[PDB]
């Protein structure tokens, strides 16, 4: 698939500004005010969305655990495993999802995917 | 992949008793005071999963930190390197899709089962 075209098409369809998009190969980024950017890229034949959050302190993670666990248990139907995945590295808590092939061919459908992913980002940002 | 042969052979190799396995499938490994380990070929990939009774909401709140730490734990044998936690009405389900490198060998696969069981033990301890 042509991911730049899919993404640009998704973003005018929902009336997003064009200035938020930055880009030959991986990856595409969408800037958001006071939020981590959404990264999009073809990763081994599948469209992948991810967001890097500054790793919370261990104490903040404990106090926010219940809320974060509820977020991670929420179904994400566009995902190959029907979940959003949370990955931890030394520096980041990374939200990650691999999108099903059925949803990467239509810019209108893909906009709803990006918007639901953003909503998940919003909830996580709220408790960090 | 002959999954029945892989599993039986994994369990001999670590001296488990043969009484604990039952069954094309899925195959169950019964363990005491705990959910069984279910194993099956699901679209060409070996999948392991364990069904835990959905905790009450208050219990989830008091165990959330321990359950979050468990899920953030690296699981190197997984395709996405995590153990996934799935919620259904009746169950909190631990799930992993095992990666090809680890499913041709009964000796290697026994270690995958053992690490998976360890993750089940940690979750059982806070539910
Ligand atoms: S218009 C900015 C925007 C982009 C996208 C990721 C699709 N969103 O959820 C909003 C609407 C915030
Ligand atoms: S011997 C019982 C057993 C089976 C398996 C799931 C492989 N295990 O981790 C133990 C050793 C508990």
Numbering used by the authors:
A (entry chain B): 4 to 26, 29 to 133
B (entry chain A): 4 to 26, 30 to 133
What does the report in the manuscript say about this coordinate set?
The type 3 secretion system (T3SS) of Shigella flexneri is an essential component of bacterial virulence. Before transport across the T3SS, in the bacterial cytoplasm, many effectors require a chaperone to prevent any premature or incorrect interactions, to hold them in a state competent for secretion, and to aid secretion itself. One such chaperone of S. flexneri is Spa15. This belongs to a promiscuous subset of the effector chaperone class, chaperoning at least five effectors of unrelated sequence.
Spin-labeled Spa15 was crystallised, and its structure solved. Spa15 has three α-helices and a twisted six-stranded β−sheet, interacting with a partner via a right-angled α to α-helix hydrophobic interface, involving Leu74 and Leu78 with Ile73, Leu91, and Leu98. Due to favourable energetics, the multi-methyl substituted pyrrol ring lies solely within a largely hydrophobic pocket, containing the residues Ile17, Ile35, Ile43, Ile23, Leu119, Leu14, and Leu37. The closest interactions lie from the MTSL C6 to CD1 of Ile17, and from the MTSL O to ND1 of His120. The distance between spin-labeled cysteines observable in the crystal structure, taking the measurement from the centremost point of the N–O bond, was 4.5 nm and corresponds exactly to that determined by DEER. This shows that the same conformation of dimer exists in the frozen solution state for the DEER measurements as in the crystalline environment.
